Amino acid sequence: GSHMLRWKHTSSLKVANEPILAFSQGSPERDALQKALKDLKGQTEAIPCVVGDEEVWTSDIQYQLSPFNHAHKVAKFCYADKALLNRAIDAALAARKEWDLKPMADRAQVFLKAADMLSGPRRAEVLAKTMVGQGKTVIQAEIDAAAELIDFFRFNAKFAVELEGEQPISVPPSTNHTVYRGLEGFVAAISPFNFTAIGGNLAGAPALMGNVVLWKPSDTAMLASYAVYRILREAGLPPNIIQFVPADGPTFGDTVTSSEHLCGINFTGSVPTFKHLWRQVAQNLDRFRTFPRLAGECGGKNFHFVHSSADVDSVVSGTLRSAFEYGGQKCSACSRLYVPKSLWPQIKGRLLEEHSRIKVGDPAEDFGTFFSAVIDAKAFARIKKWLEHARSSPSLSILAGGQCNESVGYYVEPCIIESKDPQEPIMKEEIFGPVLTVYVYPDDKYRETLKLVDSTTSYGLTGAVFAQDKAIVQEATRMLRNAAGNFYINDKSTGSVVGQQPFGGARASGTNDKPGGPHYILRWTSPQVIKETHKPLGDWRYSYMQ
Amino acid sequence: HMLRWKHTSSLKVANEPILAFSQGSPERDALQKALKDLKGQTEAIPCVVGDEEVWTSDIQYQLSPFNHAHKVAKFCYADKALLNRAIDAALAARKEWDLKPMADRAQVFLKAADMLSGPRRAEVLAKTMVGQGKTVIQAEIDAAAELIDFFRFNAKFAVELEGEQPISVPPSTNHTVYRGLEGFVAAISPFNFTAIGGNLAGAPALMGNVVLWKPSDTAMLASYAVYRILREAGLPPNIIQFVPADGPTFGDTVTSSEHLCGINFTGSVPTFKHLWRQVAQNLDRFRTFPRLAGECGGKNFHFVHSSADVDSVVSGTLRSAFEYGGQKCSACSRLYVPKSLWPQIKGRLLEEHSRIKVGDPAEDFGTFFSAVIDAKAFARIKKWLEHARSSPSLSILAGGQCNESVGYYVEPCIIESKDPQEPIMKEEIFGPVLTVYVYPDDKYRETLKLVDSTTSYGLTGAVFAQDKAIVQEATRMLRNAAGNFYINDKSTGSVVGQQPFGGARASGTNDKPGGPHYILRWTSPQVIKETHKPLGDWRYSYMQ
């Protein structure tokens, strides 16, 4: 009755959130970051595609510009052509079986080592590249390229190693065991400009689970994304496990959805693009060896709802941060504020006062900067068009800000707008800029207004309620159950922390796979169950048949 | 502390015993009585929307497979209008159900499980026997044990899922709310397991969803019995709508609703692909991205190494290939045998074959298996038998007969193929048809590669061998050839909580019903962060 398959005990991992640094004057991290910023001034990095260990250049040359000084080309890179993408697929597939068979703990080690590199010796580098290339301030780069990315790597490693301990029941005469296989084929990872960490997670989490990946990073985050890629390779990621393949979006999607070996798309970006990819997979369903798994996070139109019992100062500070940090370029950013008439004079006064103190400028040169330029010319143009809409629309009034200037960087001042119409298009459409719209509701219609918060937009990502009345908090929490996948009581709608607020929402906001939580990795494994029976089978007949 | 989170508890459950049905036993007496209760009976089964029993003019009949003159049920197809009303009524009931504590929803399923275990066991077994053509033991493992286990184990998994909570750090408290999906779920269940219908509709309902359940026409009698048990166990109105319907009509209607949030499907590859494509076509109409779960069949193998225990190969293969007429997504239909063992295995298979009784499972408990499910299945299987008679690379070694004059009767059939790539080695027949390929002993490794490469499927498979090195090698080589992989056991008969069931390649999405993660497909988590102290400045210290 000897067991021919032997299963080894699996270990556990102790991890904690990466501490956020203060960057106080005289601190080593402030000095190190200033040096790293200086190291990037006037520099352009030539960033190749990487397939296996080969640096590959195509003729389709592209540039990443510094958002706050667009004369500065921070990187020159190139778009992979269809030939290179297909070569990358073939090479990844040829490397997959060995990587998938590697113990989970050994794959995890790569990510734990990368996390330690990011935490210590490479922190200043990835922060500086995120600041200069994506226009983040010190603290926005810190929470993203350091803390969040590090946390994704450590927490997903923990969740993955511990997943192997989730095993079925065995009853004599048999032993049952679940093998957490990677997906058979390759995964396409498509990451956004606004968080360096998201690129690391979109490519990294599937790789952790035994997959091979073609990673198309965001053009406007290339410098920091490549830094992360190199760190993973230095941390021991073998060749052909993650292919670094910047590419034209449509071209990339066409190529990966045309491969019989596509097994997943891990996407963060626009609703229309996610839908397009979903439709391409559906169109090509007959060619795939298996059913591809699509994961998408697709944005929001997020709210701060204020009840008359709210702490005014908390509303003001939390809303200013949520609406304007990183120029409002977060899928979680507050863009609609609902205020009761009774509190509006106080809140309006405070918002306008604090608004006048917000500094917009160069985040590398002036650490006094609250936020800097938006990401690129396309974003600038879109935001400018909304500001013009606000000026023309009778129902919209600009209370503060409204200016923009793209002569040196893509600079947009923080803008506060009041709408008399809770259904105005500006209350519905995601702007991805520093543009806050306020709707003032009569206190006596708070319940009807909560229904409007829930029904006005197509999105379901984040939202906050500010209130100190328990009954109201309970009621609002029930009414807004599906209006936000990340819901906040007396805190701002942005700044989810890995392991604390797993992030994601439904409605138009995506598939809600909750990166940052313990279940996200399950999308990237296809379990097999093995039953070994240790005694001979008896007769095919059953006793009741006699 | 505006929000207080009541502590969650654990739930202890064990597998339901499989009963022996020995002479004089309470279960055998009860089953015989229940079978007698069904003889000559036709139940008129309505659509059920809320508590309303609804009849349309589109009358349909379920026939007893082994005696098709016996109409075991008269039912009707829900039209587009009725399906749309069912959606509307379900959606209006959803919020209250979703807000009900997980433990309270679980209680309905635990009560249903106890009913199925005891007072309703004979009923659901008998209805599965008479309506779907199962023998006593096949009905027992399905309508009792598997269904009871789905209900108890999913309840345990769901209650314990609420204990999976994030880290809280002062001054904030974080909590995950495992919300049901917003919208309705369409459950589309197959004829071949009463339990699967219960799971496809029941698991999403457990997680706070509302469901339109289209049961299989050819399993209507037992499916409605399960539905009624759920309602009696406390399932409120409009949580599961009982809506038999024409397949295309049902799919067209649910995929046309802006409120579709999931399809839980078990059935054919082409139908699943069609539904997937309908959802993709209508993406712009949906309020959210619908979640499709599909289990889509297999072309499953038993691979024999020369060191195998021959008697185990023989009994395991006869069971896997022929129990319930081979009408399992897990059934062995391709057997690979080394030349050195073939004279033994051939001789034993052919001798035991002659002893297999095919007949009426209600009247003769000596029956190994009975008629296949319906006229369409009979015709498809006959086409394959005719192909075997035509093809020069295929030889019928035993069986090959069929007769639909009284029931849809197909004898067990054993075929040898000289071509390991013959279409019969690739395509799912869903009948009692076993094809054998004999390989030279010294080419076992090349043959393992063929096991992996020949078909489009990835569901079940077994290796019979008593050599550790060979088992380790085969296990590695066949890693993606089977999502349920067996060493020295038959490829069918997965048990909830022991062998979570499913596979990839063309076999579906592999969500592993029967395991702890399946329920995650039917929840959309929300995380609530409550901060207990006023927020500070919007400025940061490093800015000063």
Counting beta carbons within 10 angstroms of the beta carbon of residue A116, is it exposed (0 to 12), middle (13 to 18) or buried (19 or more)?
middle
CA distance A24 to B379: 80
Q: Does residue A169 belong to the interface with chain B, where contact is any CB pair within 8 Å?
A: yes
Residues forming a β-bridge with A77: A47, A62
CA distance A239 to B220: 55
Element at B382 (helix H, strand E) = helix B375-390
CA angle B524, B525, B529 (to 5 degrees): 150
CB B379 within 8 A of CB B370: no
CA distance B235 to A77: 60
Distances in Å between the alpha carbon of B418 and those of B15, B321, B424, B436, B450?
43, 19, 11, 9, 14
Chains A and B: how many Cβ contacts under 8 Å? 287
Counting beta carbons within 10 angstroms of the beta carbon of residue B16, is it exposed (0 to 12), middle (13 to 18) or buried (19 or more)?
buried
Q: State how far Cα A394 lies from the chain centre.
A: 36
Query: A143 to chain B nearest CA, in Å?
Result: 13
CA distance A416 to A526: 48
Q: Which residues of A touch B475 (CB under 8 A)?
A: 5, 530
From the list B329, B332, B402, B413, the catalytic residue is B329
Q: Which residues of B touch A484 (CB under 8 A)?
A: 526
The beta strands (E) that lie in B189-247 are given as: 211-214, 240-242
CA distance A303 to A349: 20
Strands A242-244, A212-216: pairing is parallel
Looking at chain B, which residue has its C-alpha nearest residue A172?
Answer: B498
Element at B396 (helix H, strand E) = strand B394-398
> At which residue do the structure tokens 């923009």 appear?
A404
Name the residue type at position A208.
L
Widest CA span in chain A: 92
From the list B295, B323, B411, B422, the catalytic residue is B295
- Give Cβ neighbours of residue A90 (< 8 Å, ≥ 6 apart): none
Domains of chain B and any CATH numbers: 1-296+496-544 (3.40.605.10), 297-495 (3.40.309.10)
Closest C-alpha to B230, from B260, B257, B252, B200:
B200
User: Is residue A173 reached through a cis peptide bond, with omega within 30 degrees of 0 on the bond before it?
Assistant: yes
- Which DSSP state fits A237? P
> Strands of A435-441's sheet, edge to edge?
A396-400, A415-419, A435-441, A334-340, A302-306, A462-466, A486-489, B523-531, B172-180
CA distance B454 to B425: 8
B295 in active site: yes
Q: What is the 3-state secondary structure (H, E, C) of A278-306?
A: HHHHHHCHHHCCCCCEEEEECCCCEEEEE
CB A337 within 8 A of CB A375: no
Mutate to test the interface with A, among B369, B535, B541, B544 (most CBs of A within 10 A): B535
CA distance B372 to B369: 9
Q: Which residues of A touch B367 (CB under 8 A)?
A: 545
Residues 431-470 (B) with a CB less than 8 A from some CB of A: 456, 458, 468
Closest C-alpha to B367, from A541, A293, A196:
A541
Residues 82-141 (A) with a CB less than 8 A from some CB of B: 100-101, 138-139
Considering CB atoms only, which of B174, B284, B497 is closest to A500?
A: B174
Q: State how far Cα A507 lies from the chain centre.
A: 17
CA distance B134 to B125: 9
**For the stretch B267-295, what's the b/e string if a residue is b when 16 or more beta carbons lie within 10 angstroms of its beta carbon?**
bbbebbbbbbebbbeebeebbbbbbbbbb
Q: Does residue A299 belong to the interface with chain B, where contact is any CB pair within 8 Å?
A: no
CA distance B207 to B204: 5
Looking at chain B, which residue has its C-alpha nearest residue A505?
Answer: B526
CA distance B152 to A354: 57
CB A498 within 8 A of CB B273: no
DSSP B232-283: HTTPPTTSEEE----HHHHHHHHHT-TTEEEEEEES-HHHHHHHHHHHHHTG
Counting beta carbons within 10 angstroms of the beta carbon of residue B77, is it exposed (0 to 12), middle (13 to 18) or buried (19 or more)?
buried
Looking at chain B, which residue has its C-alpha nearest residue A461?
Answer: B526
CB B108 within 8 A of CB B235: yes
Rounded to the nearest 5°, which phi and psi values hold at B51? -110, 5
Q: Which residues of A touch B509 (CB under 8 A)?
A: 291, 293
CA distance B94 to B238: 8
- Give Cβ neighbours of residue B213 (< 8 Å, ≥ 6 apart): B187, B189, B197, B200, B201, B227, B240, B241, B242, B243
Residue B239 structure tokens: 């949580």
DSSP A479-505: HTTTT-SEEEESS-S----TTTS----
Element at B114 (helix H, strand E) = helix B102-117
Give the resolution to one decimal, in Å. 1.3
CA distance A450 to A468: 16
DSSP A176-226: EEEEEEEPSSEEEEE--SS-HHHHHHHHHHHHHTT-EEEEE--GGGHHHHH
CA distance A431 to A328: 9
Q: Does residue A211 belong to the interface with chain B, where contact is any CB pair within 8 Å?
A: no
Is B204 one of the annotated binding-site residues? no
CA distance A461 to A479: 15
Is A308 one of the annotated binding-site residues? no
Residue A114 structure tokens: 């990368």
CB A9 within 8 A of CB A104: no
Considering CB atoms only, which of B137, B468, B530 is closest to A490?
A: B530
Closest C-alpha to B127, from B226, B29, B28:
B226
CA distance A292 to B294: 12
> At which residue do the structure tokens 């010319």 appear?
A377
> Strands of B211-214's sheet, edge to edge?
B52-54, B47-49, B240-242, B211-214, B184-188, B260-266, B291-295
Query: B290 to chain A nearest CA, in Å?
Result: 8
